[PDB]
C-alpha cells in the first residue's frame, strides 16, 4: 500500500467566503482557527468542490468518484482514496498581511435589491482578503497500482475545473475564485514511484 | 390499626393549639368529628406521640377562620390537607413540626414493634431517665436515594423532536423519583411524613432501624438495580445508602446530625464507584446479535426498534411531552404511555381519565400537578393559551407587530445551591424541619411561583428547579421577565441566594439543540466569576442584574427611547452610527462622537451623559448594549 | 519495552463520543488499537504481533508544561476534585497520597490547556441536483494548541515495537477518528523513550490504576470486582471496513472499565470479538495497562 503526498498552496484571486450576531455588525463570518483565530479552508469543502466538478465534467455515482472520494452504498463500500485536510492560513501570507497592517479579512457591504418595493436591503459578508495563501495538504491513497494515474488525471481536471470555478460561498456574484500552486508530488508511504505524477 | 391511629394522632397532635390561638381543647375539639374521635387520635391529641414531639421538639380572627375551615373539611389526603393549612403558621411551621413528629412516631413505633415492648408508655416513662436513655439507643435511619444519570439523560437526545424531548425527560426523572420512594414507602407501610424532602435526582427519608425495614430497604436495592439495568443498562442508575442514628442526633446533640448526613453521602459516592456486580458486567458483555437498527435518540439496538428510528421508552418520552403539559394528573397504571420500576407505567391523563384508571384498577398511583398525591412542576407555555397559537408553538412568540422578531433562551442556575444546601443554615440552626422547610420553598417558587412570575409573558419553560432552569420565550419578555425573577428570588430568600442565568438571542428556525449549548454556555460565563451577575446575548456582555436592569435599561434606554421618538430629525440610522463609533473604540472616534452630538441637537443633558458614557469603559459597553436593545426593540 | 508515543495533530480531530456533533479530546486505547489494526491490514502486516503483544494507552493529554494522567477513582469541596479529570505526572503521586486540596485541585484542572472544542457546521448538497435540498449537519472537532498534543505509552517486544512504528508512520497520513478523509485528524507522531513513565511504571503500590480502557476475562472478573472503584463505559460502534458486510453493521455492545479505575487485585485484559457473523473478526482492544500506586 503506498501513501502519496501532495503539498501546495491556494492563492486567492478574489475574496473567499467558506462562511459555516450583533446589530450593525457582519451577518456573515468565515470559518477560522479557534485558536489562532486565522481563517481556514475546511478540507471538507474543497473534497465537496472537486467532487462535483469532477462529477458535473464526467456526468455523483461514478466508479471513479466513488473510489477517489469514498462511497458507503450497500455492496460499494470503498475507502476515500483522497484525504483533502484543512487549508490554514500561510505564514507568508501572515508576514506580508502584517507588513501594511492588512487585516487578514475583510468585510464586504452588499444589499439587495427587491423587485416590488425596490427598497435595499443591507447585508455585511467576512471574506479572507484577495493575496492571501493557504497551505493546502493532500493525501492519495494507492488502492489499486493500475488505476493511478487515471485517478491522478481525475484530479488534474477536477483541479483545473476548480481554477475556473470558485470555492465555498457566494462564487457566481465574485467570491471565491482561487489558484492552486502544486509545491510538491511526494511519496510519503510505500516505494511507488509518483516522480511523473501531476496535478497541473 | 394501631400504627394507623397512632400516625393520625401524631399529625393532629397540635390542632388544639390552633384551636388556643383563635391538648386538652385539641382534643375536645376532635370529639365533634367522630372518625377523628374515636379510640388513638384523641387520646394522642390529649398527651409514642409524646416522645415524638419530645424528639420533634429537640390576629384570632385569622385562628377563628382556620379553625372554621378546619371543622369544615373535618393518611395522604390528610397529610396534604394538614400541609395546605398548616404551611404559614408557627409551631419551624405547625405542618413541618406535625409532619416530623408523625414520621419519628411511625419509626418509634415500629422500632418498638421489632422490639416487642410489653407497655410502651411504662417502659418508657417509668424511671423517667429511660426517656433520655432512649435518645441513645440507636433507633432511626437516615435514607438518602439518589438517582444517576439525569442530565445525560434529557440531553441524550438528537434535536429532531428537542423540545419535546427535553420537557418530557426532566418530568419523567422526577416522576419516577417520586415513584420510588412511593415504592419504598409502600415497602415499609410508612407515609409521606417520613421522606424528609426529595431533591431533583435525590430523595432523603427518615426510617424505622427495625430488621425488616433494612431488609426491606436492601431488597428494594436489588430491585431497584435490577429494574434500572434491565431497562435503561447503564444510562440510569439508583444508589440507596442508610446511616443509623439516635434520638439525641435528630436533636442536634453534639452537632452529629450535620455530619450523619454527611456519612450517607459518603455511602452514596460508595454505591456509585462499585456500581455493577460482576454478573450485571458479564450480562451487558454477553451480547448475542449486534441489531440491524437503533434507536435514533437513544441509540440502542437491542430493544426493538420501530419504523420510525425509534425504541418504545423514547417514542413515549415523545408522546408523553404534550400530554405532562396539557393534563394535571399523572397515572401510575398497569397501561400507560411510559415505563415505571415496577410493572407499571406513567400515562398524563385528565380527571376523568383519573378517575376510570383508578377505579379500572385498583393499583393505580394518582398525582396531581399543581392543585391522589399533588406534585408541584412549573409548565407555564404562553403558545397553549390558544389553539391556533399552541399550533404555532415558539413561532407564535417571535409573531411581533414590532421589535427583531427573535427568541430569547434563558438557561439559569441558582448559584451555590450546593453550598445552601450544605451550609446555608448555621450550625446553631441546623435541624431536619429547617432543611425540609429551606428545600420545599426553594422547590416552590421553582414549581409554583415560578407560573405566576411568568405569568402574561410570551415565554415556554422547558424545564424548572433551583438545579437548571430552562425556558424559551420571545426575547424582549425572557429579560424582563429574568430580571422579575432575580428581584423576586432574593425578596423570597430575603437575601444570602443569588442566581446566575445566560440569556441568548435566536431566530425561531434555529435548532433547540444549538439554542441549548449556545446559551449553556452563557450561563457558564456568569457562573464561573461574578455569579450573581447575568450575561446577555454576547461572551462580551456579562452585567449584573441591578447594572442590567437599572444602569443599562432605565438610565441609558430609557433616555435614548425617549429622546429618538420625540426627535423628527433622527433616526435608527443616528444611532448606528452612535454604535460604530462606540464599538470602534478609538481615541478619535470618543472626538468623533462629540462632533456628531453637537451637530445631532440632542438635549444637552442626554448630550453630555452621552460623551460622559463613552469615555467611561463600564457605561460605553452599558451604552453599546443599550442601544442594541433599543435597535432590536425599534426594528420592524 | 514501554516507549511514549507523542502525537501533534496539525488539523481539528473530531473523536466522536456518541454523535457527529459532540466531539472528545482524547481516544480510547481500542480505537487506536482498531486504527493500528486497519493500517497493519491496509500494508499487509501480520496481526499477531498486535493480537498478542502488544499493550498499549489511552491517549493522554499532554502540555509542553506537563503530561497528564487519568484521574484515579480513589476515595478521599467535592465540586473541585469531580470537576477535574487529569492530573500531571508529577502530582500524581500527591494526589494518591491525599495531600492535594480543593484549591490545588482547581489549579491542577486550569493547569491542562489541551486545546479549544468547537463546533463546524457543514452542509451536504448531494440532493441539490435532484430538486432536493442542502441539508445541514455538524462536526464536532476539538483544535489543540500548539505545545499541547495526545501521546500514548505502547509495551512490547522488539518485534511489535517495530511494526508499531511503522504503523504509526502510516497512520499520520491516515489519521485519526471520525471524519478523517474529510479534513481532520491529520497528525504527526514521535516515538522515544520516556525516563519519567518508566520510572513511574516501575512503582509496586498497593493500589492499581487502569491506564487503559480495560474489561477482564470471567474468570479474571470474579477476583477483580471486589473493592473496585470503576466506571463501566459503554463501547459501542459501527463496523468499519469494506468486506466485513455489503451494508454497514454496527458492532456487538461492549462494557469497559474506564481509565483511572482503580482495582485492587490487577487482571491481564483481552483483544474481545465485537463481530456478529461477519466476514472477519472485529477485534475490540480490552487489555489491561496498570500504573501501581500507594494510597
Given at each position: ?20 450576531s450583533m ?178 | ?405 427573535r427568541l430569547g433562551v434563558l438557561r439559569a442556575d441558582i448559584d451555590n445551591l ?27 417558587f421553582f414549581?409554583?411561583?415560578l407560573?405566576?412570575i411568568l405569568?402574561?409573558a410570551?415565554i415556554?419553560v422547558?424545564?424548572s428547579?433551583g438545579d437548571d432552569l430552562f425556558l424559551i420565550g420571545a426575547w424582549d419578555d425572557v429579560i424582563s421577565k429574568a430580571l422579575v425573577l432575580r428581584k423576586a428570588f432574593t425578596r423570597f430568600s430575603?437575601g444570602?441566594l443569588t442566581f446566575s442565568a445566560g440569556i441568548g438571542m435566536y ?8 439554542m441549548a449549548s449556545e446559551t449553556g454556555v452563557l450561563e457558564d460565563l456568569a457562573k464561573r466569576g461574578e455569579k450573581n451577575q447575568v450575561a446577555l446575548w454576547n461572551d462580551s456582555k456579562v452585567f449584573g442584574w441591578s447594572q442590567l436592569e437599572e444602569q443599562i435599561l432605565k438610565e441609558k434606554m ?60 463600564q457605561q460605553?459597553v452599558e451604552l453599546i448594549t443599550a442601544?442594541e436593545y433599543?435597535?432590536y426593540q425599534?426594528?420592524? | ?295
Open positions: 500500500y503506498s501513501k502519496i503526498r501532495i503539498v501546495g498552496k491556494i492563492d486567492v484571486l478574489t475574496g473567499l467566503h467558506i462562511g459555516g446589530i450593525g455588525a457582519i451577518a456573515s463570518p468565515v470559518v477560522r482557527d479557534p485558536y489562532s483565530r486565522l481563517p481556514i479552508i475546511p478540507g471538507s469543502s474543497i473534497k465537496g468542490k472537486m467532487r462535483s466538478l469532477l462529477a458535473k465534467h464526467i456526468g455523483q455515482d461514478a466508479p471513479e468518484i466513488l473510489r477517489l472520494f469514498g462511497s458507503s452504498q450497500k455492496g460499494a463500500i470503498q475507502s476515500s482514496r483522497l484525504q483533502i485536510s484543512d487549508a490554514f492560513f500561510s505564514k507568508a501570507s501572515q508576514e506580508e498581511f502584517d507588513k501594511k497592517d492588512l487585516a487578514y479579512t475583510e468585510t464586504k457591504f452588499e444589499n439587495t435589491i427587491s423587485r416590488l418595493t425596490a427598497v435595499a436591503n443591507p447585508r455585511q459578508i467576512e471574506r479572507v482578503t484577495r493575496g492571501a495563501s493557504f497551505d493546502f495538504h493532500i493525501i492519495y491513497n494507492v488502492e489499486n497500482i493500475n488505476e493511478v494515474m487515471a485517478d491522478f488525471e481525475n484530479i488534474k481536471t477536477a483541479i483545473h475545473l476548480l481554477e475556473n470555478d470558485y470555492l465555498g460561498g457566494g462564487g457566481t456574484r465574485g467570491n471565491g475564485r482561487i489558484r492552486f500552486v502544486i509545491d510538491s508530488i511526494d511519496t510519503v508511504v510505500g516505494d511507488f514511484d509518483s516522480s511523473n505524477l501531476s496535478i497541473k | 390499626n394501631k400504627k394507623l391511629e397512632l400516625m393520625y394522632g401524631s399529625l393532629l397532635h397540635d390542632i388544639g393549639k390552633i384551636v388556643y390561638r383563635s391538648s386538652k381543647i385539641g382534643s375536645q375539639f376532635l370529639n365533634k368529628f367522630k372518625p377523628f374521635q374515636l379510640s388513638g387520635i384523641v387520646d394522642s391529641v390529649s398527651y409514642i406521640t409524646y416522645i415524638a414531639d419530645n424528639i420533634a421538639s429537640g390576629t384570632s380572627s385569622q385562628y377563628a377562620a382556620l379553625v372554621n375551615k378546619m371543622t369544615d373539611d373535618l393518611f395522604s389526603s390528610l397529610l396534604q390537607w394538614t400541609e395546605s393549612l398548616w404551611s404559614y403558621i408557627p409551631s419551624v411551621s405547625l405542618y413541618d413540626h406535625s409532619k416530623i413528629t408523625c414520621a419519628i412516631a411511625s419509626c418509634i413505633y415500629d422500632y418498638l414493634t421489632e422490639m416487642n415492648c410489653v407497655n410502651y408508655r411504662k417502659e418508657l416513662f417509668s424511671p423517667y431517665e429511660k426517656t433520655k436513655q432512649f435518645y441513645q439507643e440507636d433507633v432511626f435511619l437516615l435514607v438518602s436515594l439518589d438517582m444517576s444519570g439525569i442530565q445525560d439523560f434529557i440531553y441524550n437526545i438528537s434535536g429532531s423532536k428537542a423540545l419535546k424531548s427535553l420537557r418530557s425527560r426532566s418530568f419523567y426523572l422526577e416522576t419516577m423519583l417520586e415513584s420510588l420512594v412511593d415504592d419504598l414507602l409502600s415497602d415499609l407501610e410508612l407515609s409521606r411524613a417520613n421522606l424528609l424532602y426529595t431533591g431533583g435526582g435525590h430523595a432523603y427519608l427518615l426510617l424505622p432501624n427495625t430488621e425488616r425495614a433494612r431488609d426491606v430497604l436492601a431488597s428494594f436495592e436489588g430491585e431497584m438495580k435490577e429494574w434500572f439495568i434491565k431497562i435503561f443498562k447503564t444510562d440510569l442508575s439508583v444508589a440507596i445508602a442508610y446511616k443509623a442514628c439516635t434520638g439525641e442526633d435528630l436533636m442536634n446533640s453534639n452537632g452529629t446530625y450535620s455530619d450523619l448526613w454527611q456519612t450517607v453521602s459518603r455511602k452514596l459516592s460508595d454505591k456509585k464507584a462499585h456500581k455493577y456486580s460482576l454478573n450485571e458486567i458479564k450480562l451487558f458483555n454477553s451480547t448475542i446479535h449486534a441489531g440491524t437498527q437503533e434507536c435514533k435518540e437513544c441509540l440502542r439496538s437491542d430493544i426493538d426498534i420501530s419504523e420510525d428510528s425509534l425504541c418504545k421508552i423514547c417514542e413515549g418520552i415523545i408522546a408523553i411531552s404534550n400530554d405532562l403539559r396539557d393534563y394535571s394528573f399523572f397515572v401510575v397504571s398497569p397501561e400507560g404511555k411510559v415505563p415505571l420500576p415496577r410493572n407499571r407505567y406513567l400515562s398524563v391523563e385528565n380527571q376523568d381519565g383519573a378517575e376510570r384508571k383508578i377505579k379500572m384498577n385498583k393499583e393505580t398511583r394518582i398525582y396531581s400537578k399543581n392543585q391522589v398525591t399533588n406534585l408541584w412542576m412549573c409548565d407555564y407555555d404562553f403558545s397553549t393559551l390558544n389553539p391556533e397559537t399552541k399550533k404555532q408553538g415558539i413561532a407564535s412568540y417571535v409573531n411581533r407587530e414590532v421589535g427583531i422578531p450546593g453550598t445552601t444546601f450544605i451550609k446555608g443554615i448555621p450550625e446553631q440552626y441546623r435541624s431536619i424541619s429547617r432543611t425540609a422547610t429551606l428545600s420545599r420553598q426553594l422547590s416552590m414549581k409554583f411561583e407560573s405566576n405569568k402574561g410570551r415556554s422547558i424545564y428547579g430575603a444570602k431566530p425561531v428556525k434555529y435548532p433547540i439543540s444549538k430609557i433616555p435614548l427611547q425617549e429622546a429618538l421618538t420625540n426627535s423628527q430629525e433622527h433616526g435608527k440610522s443616528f444611532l448606528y452610527k452612535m454604535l460604530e463609533l462606540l464599538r470602534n473604540e478609538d481615541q478619535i472616534n470618543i472626538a468623533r462622537l462629540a462632533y456628531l452630538l453637537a451637530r445631532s441637537s440632542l438635549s444637552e443633558e442626554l448630550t453630555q451623559s452621552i460623551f460622559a458614557w463613552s469615555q467611561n469603559k460605553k442601544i433599543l435597535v425599534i426594528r420592524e | 519495552v514501554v516507549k511514549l508515543v507523542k502525537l501533534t495533530f496539525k488539523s481539528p480531530v473530531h473523536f466522536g463520543m456518541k454523535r457527529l456533533s459532540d466531539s472528545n479530546h482524547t481516544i480510547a486505547a481500542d480505537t487506536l488499537f482498531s486504527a493500528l489494526i486497519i493500517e497493519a491490514l491496509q500494508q499487509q502486516l501480520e496481526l499477531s504481533h498486535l493480537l498478542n503483544n502488544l499493550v498499549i494507552t489511552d491517549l493522554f493529554p499532554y502540555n509542553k508544561t506537563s503530561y497528564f494522567l487519568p484521574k484515579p477513582l480513589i476515595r478521599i469541596g467535592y465540586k473541585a476534585f469531580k470537576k477535574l479529570t487529569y492530573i500531571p505526572v508529577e502530582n500524581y503521586s500527591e494526589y494518591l497520597r491525599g495531600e492535594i486540596d480543593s484549591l490545588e485541585a482547581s489549579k491542577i484542572a486550569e493547569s491542562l490547556n489541551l486545546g479549544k472544542a468547537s463546533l463546524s457546521t457543514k452542509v451536504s448538497l448531494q440532493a441539490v441536483d435532484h430538486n432536493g435540498e442542502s441539508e445541514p449537519y455538524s462536526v464536532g472537532n476539538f483544535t489543540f494548541y500548539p505545545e499541547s498534543g495526545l501521546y500514548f505509552l505502547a509495551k512490547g517486544n522488539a518485534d511489535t515495537i517495530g511494526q508499531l512504528e511503522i504503523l504509526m508512520h502510516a497512520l499520520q497520513y491516515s489519521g485519526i477518528g471520525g471524519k478523517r478523509s474529510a479534513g481532520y485528524g491529520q497528525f504527526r507522531c514521535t516515538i522515544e523513550d520516556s525516563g519519567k513513565f518508566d520510572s513511574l511504571l516501575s512503582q509496586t503500590g498497593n493500589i492499581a490504576i487502569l491506564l487503559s480502557s480495560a474489561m477482564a476475562s470471567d474468570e479474571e472478573l470474579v477476583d477483580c470486582l471486589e473493592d473496585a472503584r470503576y466506571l463501566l463505559k459503554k463501547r459501542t460502534g459501527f463496523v468499519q471496513s469494506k468486506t466485513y458486510a455489503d451494508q454497514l453493521v454496527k458492532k456487538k455492545d461492549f462494557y469497559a472499565f474506564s481509565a483511572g479505575s482503580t482495582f485492587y487485585q490487577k487482571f491481564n485484559g483481552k483483544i474481545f470479538d465485537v463481530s456478529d457473523n461477519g466476514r472477519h473478526s472485529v477485534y475490540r482492544y480490552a487489555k489491561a495497562f496498570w500504573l501501581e500506586g500507594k494510597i
